[PDB]
Design an enzyme around this catalytic site. Structure first.
Site, mmCIF file in Angstrom:
data_model
loop_
_atom_site.group_PDB
_atom_site.id
_atom_site.type_symbol
_atom_site.label_atom_id
_atom_site.label_comp_id
_atom_site.label_asym_id
_atom_site.label_seq_id
_atom_site.Cartn_x
_atom_site.Cartn_y
_atom_site.Cartn_z
ATOM 1 N N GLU A 43 2.081 2.381 1.783
ATOM 2 C CA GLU A 43 1.550 1.507 2.858
ATOM 3 C C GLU A 43 0.039 1.226 2.770
ATOM 4 O OE1 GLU A 43 4.203 2.217 6.563
ATOM 5 O OE2 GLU A 43 3.459 4.191 5.949
ATOM 6 N N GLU A 57 6.223 16.691 5.976
ATOM 7 C CA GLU A 57 5.875 15.652 5.009
ATOM 8 C C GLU A 57 5.111 16.248 3.853
ATOM 9 O OE1 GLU A 57 2.586 12.616 5.537
ATOM 10 O OE2 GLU A 57 4.378 11.425 5.991
ATOM 11 N N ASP A 60 2.260 -1.227 -1.080
ATOM 12 C CA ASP A 60 3.093 -0.260 -1.827
ATOM 13 C C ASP A 60 3.943 0.622 -0.888
ATOM 14 O OD1 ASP A 60 0.893 1.204 -0.904
ATOM 15 O OD2 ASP A 60 1.049 2.713 -2.488
#
Ligand SMILES: *[C@@H]1O[C@H](CO)[C@@H](O[C@@H]2O[C@H](CO)[C@@H](O)[C@H](O)[C@H]2NC(C)=O)[C@H](O)[C@H]1NC(C)=O
Ligand SMILES: *[C@@H]1O[C@H](CO)[C@@H](O)[C@H](O)[C@H]1NC(C)=O
Ligand SMILES: *[C@H]1O[C@H](CO)[C@@H](O)[C@H](O)[C@@H]1O
Ligand SMILES: *[C@H]1O[C@H](CO)[C@@H](O)[C@H](O)[C@@H]1O
EC number: 3.2.1.3
Length: 467
Positions: A179, A400, A176
């Site tokens: 990962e 992130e 996906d």
């Protein structure tokens, strides 16, 4: 009113942040090649100093969008990425060779255009589409400003390799967008469908053919229907997870077509399925983060990837928080451009949590109902971005993720994707949109879904000259 001051000033830092993350001449990425988009400058804890095709592709789409809306100064940065991909597509790797076809699924490479030969969640089959998409739009611009040689001899045969890929390998399994999950991912299939449609259109536009694009596109769109559960969109097949994931939020916004209606079959932002999905997917983070305590179902919350996530313990993500907002802003654009706002029994809860008096009905722009709802929606979406603001750094940096209890920045610093997510959401808040991909024609579900493939050609583009 409540975030415009910051948004427009942040959007400026976002643009330059991306350019510092693209070699050869990016401030934070010395050692990267011309037109390699490093995912983040951080070289340990965590080492994100690599170049992901996905990450590269989603960012370059954003840069192509800006470029076409009048930021022409991006020409060399965009070009440079085209010449980079020429070299990159031919890098033989653990996933395969260029002549094989496999290995355009290679999730990532080093910044010096050399294979990553370590264990990784490979392949990921989104990349080839996501690249072709980003490239296609700059191909359109080249055509519609009379640079046919570059559109026909440089841009097309790079896009031909990636299209050849998606038609052949779509029905085979892979990892996906996170990962992690080996299977079939919704995001992957969604963004793959778009590529063959808009790639067929673009391949017709250079006096050429994408015969394989055509045969497979409805087949993928046939398969895509199966991801709907009634309640929401499943993230992955072959998973013990709930199926609620930011994956699906992203699938909607990155297949958002402006010349299109609220179509359930291509899962557009204003469609009942994507609207129900947004209720479901966002709800799934309400109680699991201490940061969101005392934030009712009308107000916005810090959004993560998925509630089963344990990575850095599993925090809210900036791009995922920005995706919650971006779907809503595309929804607000599509209700405006239609002059309508259909409440269905599917969507019902989505509206009801924001507008207490919401109920099943079609309500045009003129109505009381439309006016009250779109305020609530605008506020809700504005709610997410206010959370993005809060935990963004003093100089505008975005990481992130940001901590689950107290909201401090976590994981890779200066994530290129985070800035692109900001640049896109902000754009859509100001009604700035990308060129249509051709959704109008590609909305008919076929009779039967045939687990099949089709083949293209695979040929290596040399960075020959500059016409
Ligand atoms: C390959 O394509 C076929 C359809 O062309 C997919 O088949 C569906 O798979 C889902 C998940 O197992 C089922 O719920 C559907 O009922 C299936 N439909 C049919 C008609 O078989 C298949 O999953 C695809 N697989 C991959 C890995 O792409
Ligand atoms: C903000 O300052 C930090 C200090 O390390 C830096 O790493 C980051 O890239 C800066 N962000 C900018 C200039 O946008
Ligand atoms: C296949 O096509 C590519 C790009 O057009 C060429 O580089 C190669 O020589 C072959 O003709
Ligand atoms: C296409 O592929 C060949 C073989 O890998 C390369 O030599 C060429 O530069 C291009 O990337």
């Amino acid at each position: 009113a409540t975030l415009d001051s910051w948004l427009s000033n942040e959007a400026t830092v976002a643009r330059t942040a991306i350019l510092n993350n693209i070699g050869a001449d990016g401030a934070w990425v010395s050692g990267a090649d011309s037109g390699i988009v490093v995912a983040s400058p951080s070289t340990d804890n965590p080492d994100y100093f690599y170049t992901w095709t996905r990450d590269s592709g989603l960012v370059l789409k954003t840069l192509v969008d800006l470029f076409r809306n009048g930021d022409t100064s991006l020409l060399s940065t965009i070009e440079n990425y085209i010449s980079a991909q020429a070299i990159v597509q031919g890098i033989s790797n653990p996933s395969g060779d260029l002549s094989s076809g496999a290995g355009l699924g290679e999730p990532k490479f080093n910044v010096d255009e050399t294979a990553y030969t370590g264990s990784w969640g490979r392949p990921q089959r989104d990349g080839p589409a996501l690249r072709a998409t980003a490239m296609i739009g700059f191909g359109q611009w080249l055509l519609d400003n009379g640079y046919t040689s570059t559109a026909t001899d440089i841009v097309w045969p790079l896009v031909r390799n990636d299209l050849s890929y998606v038609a052949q390998y779509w029905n085979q399994t892979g990892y996906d967008l996170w990962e992690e999950v080996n299977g079939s991912s919704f995001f992957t299939i969604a963004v793959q469908h778009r590529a063959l449609v808009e790639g067929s259109a673009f391949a017709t536009a250079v006096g050429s053919s994408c015969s394989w694009c055509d045969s497979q596109a409805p087949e993928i769109l046939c398969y895509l229907q199966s991801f709907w559960t009634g309640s929401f969109i499943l993230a992955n097949f072959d998973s013990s997870r709930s199926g609620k994931d930011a994956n699906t939020l992203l699938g909607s916004i990155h297949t958002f077509d402006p010349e299109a209606a609220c179509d359930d079959s291509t899962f557009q932002p204003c469609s009942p399925r994507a609207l129900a999905n947004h209720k479901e997917v966002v709800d799934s983070f309400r109680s699991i983060y201490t940061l969101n305590d005392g934030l009712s179902d009308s107000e916005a919350v810090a959004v993560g990837r998925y509630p089963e996530d344990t990575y850095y313990n599993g925090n809210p993500w900036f791009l995922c928080t920005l995706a919650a907002a971006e779907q809503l802003y595309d929804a607000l654009y599509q209700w405006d451009k239609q002059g309508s706002l259909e409440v269905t029994d599917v969507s019902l809860d989505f509206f009801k949590a924001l507008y207490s008096d919401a109920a099943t009905g079609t309500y045009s722009s003129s109505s009381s109902t439309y006016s009250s709802i779109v305020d609530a929606v605008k506020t809700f979406a504005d709610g997410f971005v206010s959370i993005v603001e809060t935990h963004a750094a003093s100089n505008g940096s975005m990481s992130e993720q940001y901590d689950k209890s107290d909201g401090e920045q976590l994981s890779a610093r200066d994530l290129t994707w985070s800035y692109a997510a900001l640049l896109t959401a902000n754009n859509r808040r100001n009604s700035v949109v990308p060129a249509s991909w051709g959704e109008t024609s590609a909305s008919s579900v076929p009779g039967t879904c045939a687990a099949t493939s089709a083949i293209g050609t695979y040929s290596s583009v040399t960075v020959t000259s500059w016409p």
